[PDB]
């Protein structure tokens, strides 16, 4: 049946977040609108290497999410870990669906360092109806171990939730910006999601993904450098990162901290430069246009100006919540804006769920 499911940030690693939008009625009109959202930091040991090592416990957390939410709904879309999925482009020939799925599996086979023992899904980077059989096939494959998917369906089964879509974060984060991207149909845009476990880059023409690349570096690395240089626990080093780096009174601490985080800033900048250079192969001659940031690791004070000057691209924070109606009597736009970067995916597969 046609349900409006729900949306968790299941591979937040730092935080399990969840969002409910639905058909909100005002004055006889109805549109998608924010109904609830919820956030709880992920207890350690629940996720290791992108897999759910403690399914039942993560369940306890998710159920806390749902009751905090005060939500009736028990269907969910969610996402796999960027560390748990291989995303990559694949060229084939256009044919019948079965022959494409089998051919797709066959070509992925070498590119997957595991047996299959793999869950596979593709989508075509260009519309298949625009080309004939045998010509101009391009699918991109998302590939994953059963043990990961099975871990996640475990967690979901036990929260009393029923999954309908297991999506991927680099593209789920885009659904909030897809209209605004579809406004410029020939502009090349970059989208960085700097998370706690991984940083994704996806770069597009319009809301047509051209490619994606996932970098092991993330906010965990900043926190871990802070922790190393002041023998601090992870959580206190995390707080020192957050409030340490951005307070109006922080004038004495960007020496002590920035000197700690400077190697990470350098290595992130070099890895992003490297990724951009590895893309930039047919437009020899050109430059970039504009880009956005998502993920809480983005919120590092001044990091946006640094990435802007260092990558030669205007990098801007963006408010996902502009894609959904927000009742000002139930949510104030200021904070909603404040947690927009963390919640981008969390409302991402969320517009996926009343699709």
């Amino acid at each position: 049946a046609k349900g409006k499911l729900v949306l968790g940030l299941d591979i937040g690693s730092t935080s399990i977040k969840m969002i409910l939008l639905k058909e909100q009625r005002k004055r006889g009109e109805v549109i998608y609108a924010l109904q609830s959202f919820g956030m709880k930091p992920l207890p350690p040991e629940a996720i290791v290497d992108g897999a759910l090592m403690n399914s039942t416990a993560i369940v306890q957390a998710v159920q806390d999410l749902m009751s905090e939410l005060k939500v009736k709904g028990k269907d969910v879309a969610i996402g796999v870990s960027g560390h748990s999925v291989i995303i990559k482009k694949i060229q084939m020939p256009r044919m019948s669906q079965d022959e494409l799925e089998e051919s797709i599996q066959w070509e992925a086979e070498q590119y997957i360092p595991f047996d299959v023992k793999d869950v596979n899904i593709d989508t075509q980077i260009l519309d298949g109806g625009g080309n004939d059989a045998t010509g101009q096939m391009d699918v991109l494959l998302v590939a994953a171990k059963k043990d990961m998917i099975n871990d996640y369906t475990t967690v979901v089964s036990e929260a009393g939730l029923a999954p309908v879509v297991v999506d991927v974060d680099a593209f789920a984060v885009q659904n909030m910006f897809s209209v605004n991207y579809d406004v410029p149909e020939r502009e090349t845009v970059v989208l960085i999601n700097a998370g706690a476990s991984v940083v994704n880059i996806n770069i597009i023409s319009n809301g047509a993904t051209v490619f994606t690349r996932d970098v092991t570096i993330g906010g965990n690395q900043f926190t871990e450098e802070i922790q190393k240089q002041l023998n601090v626990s992870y959580e206190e080093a995390e707080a020192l990162k957050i409030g340490g780096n951005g307070a109006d009174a922080d004038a004495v601490v960007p020496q002590d901290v920035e000197r700690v985080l400077s190697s990470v800033a350098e290595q992130v900048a070099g890895e992003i430069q490297r990724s951009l250079d590895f893309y930039a192969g047919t437009a020899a001659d050109s430059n970039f246009s504009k880009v956005y940031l998502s993920g809480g690791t983005a919120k590092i004070p001044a990091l946006f100006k640094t990435i802007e000057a260092r990558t030669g691209v205007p990098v801007e924070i963006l408010n996902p919540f502009r894609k959904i109606e927000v009742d000002n009597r139930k949510f104030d736009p200021a904070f909603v804006m404040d947690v927009a970067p963390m919640a981008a995916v969390a409302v991402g597969l969320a517009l996926r769920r009343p699709g």
């Binding site: 869950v119 991109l140 879509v165």
Partner: protein
């Protein structure tokens, strides 16, 4: 825009299918063995009738 869904298709499907086929094979073998056990039962009832005829004799 790319819309992907790793919610379980192929490997479970292949395993549910193999699970079906192995059971059909079980069923076929057991029906055949059944028919053997039968046919045997009939030759045994015939032998019993011949022997009861002899006992009457």
């Amino acid at each position: 825009m790319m819309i992907r869904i790793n919610l379980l298709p192929v490997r479970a499907v292949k395993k549910r299918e193999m699970g079906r086929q192995v059971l059909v094979l079980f069923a076929v073998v057991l029906i055949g063995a059944g028919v053997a056990n039968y046919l045997w039962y009939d030759d045994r009832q015939s032998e019993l009738e011949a022997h009861q005829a002899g006992v009457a004799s």
